[PDB]
DNA sequence: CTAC
DNA sequence: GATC
DNA sequence: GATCGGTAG
């Protein structure tokens, strides 16, 4: 019995049908995604929004089913500026967003195309996929670096309006949100620094991480499984696929999905349903 | 190979 | 990164 | 931990 993701709640707290959906994933190679008919389940899933992280398209050619999307006419792109098939993220819309900007406004991040804020009405959805620190943690210093960074670009976003911010985070926040809390300390994705980083952001901002709000103590939860020693048979799983929400959302708030039959990657993925 |  |  | 061990560009 370790996890099956309960049945879709389509209303807010106080009532209200959910009026926007919005599905983030990881696809860990866009094409590759793809060919594993990846599609055929968002096509079904029908998102009013779509985003998603490791695109890695920088070959200035995106599939052709892409423009077979007549729920998600509005696409947008950010991938890096000197990197071939690597990272790359995208932001896919059934209405027109305000205004569709990239990167977090600090030169020294924006260059591996990680961050898409896409302005609407009511809100600012901002998707991610954060720099990994790697193996080794050979990275880790400049992971910190981000992390501060990202943090204070996003507190100013959410002064003007609302802030949604889906994606991969790349970090299991408390020891529930992975299968090894104790046997990973030092690996790269659950590191303290790391996992300070993310309290930071949610206490900063302020912002609050949808499903551990309303699922409080439900574990063995996961987004990511690493496709080695067939960890995703035995649920041996991350939770790095996050919906941060403002706290003024949280009445909004109708239901936070962790979409984990869904196949294509390495992460599965994850859904939220607001009466906007 | 490499970063995942 | 999960294993032993 | 020393090892063994999946991947899309
Ligand atoms: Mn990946």
Known sequence: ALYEDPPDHKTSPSGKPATLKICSWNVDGLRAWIKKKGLDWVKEE??????????????????????????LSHQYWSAPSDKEGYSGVGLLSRQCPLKVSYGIGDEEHDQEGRVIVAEFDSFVLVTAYVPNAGRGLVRLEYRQRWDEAFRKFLKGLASRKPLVLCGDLNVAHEEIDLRNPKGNKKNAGFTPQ??????????????????????????YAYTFWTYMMNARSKNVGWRLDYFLLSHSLLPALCDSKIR????????????????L
């Open 46 to 71: 029908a998102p009013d929004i779509l985003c998603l992280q490791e695109t890695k398209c920088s070959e200035n050619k995106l599939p052709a089913e892409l423009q077979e999307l007549p729920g």
């Open 194 to 219: 790391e996992r300070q980083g993310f309290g930071e952001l949610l206490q900063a901002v302020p912002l609050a991480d949808s499903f551990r709000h309303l699922y409080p103590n439900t574990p």
């Open 260 to 275: 984990s039959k869904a196949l294509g990657s390495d992460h599965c993925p994850i859904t939220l349903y607001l009466a």
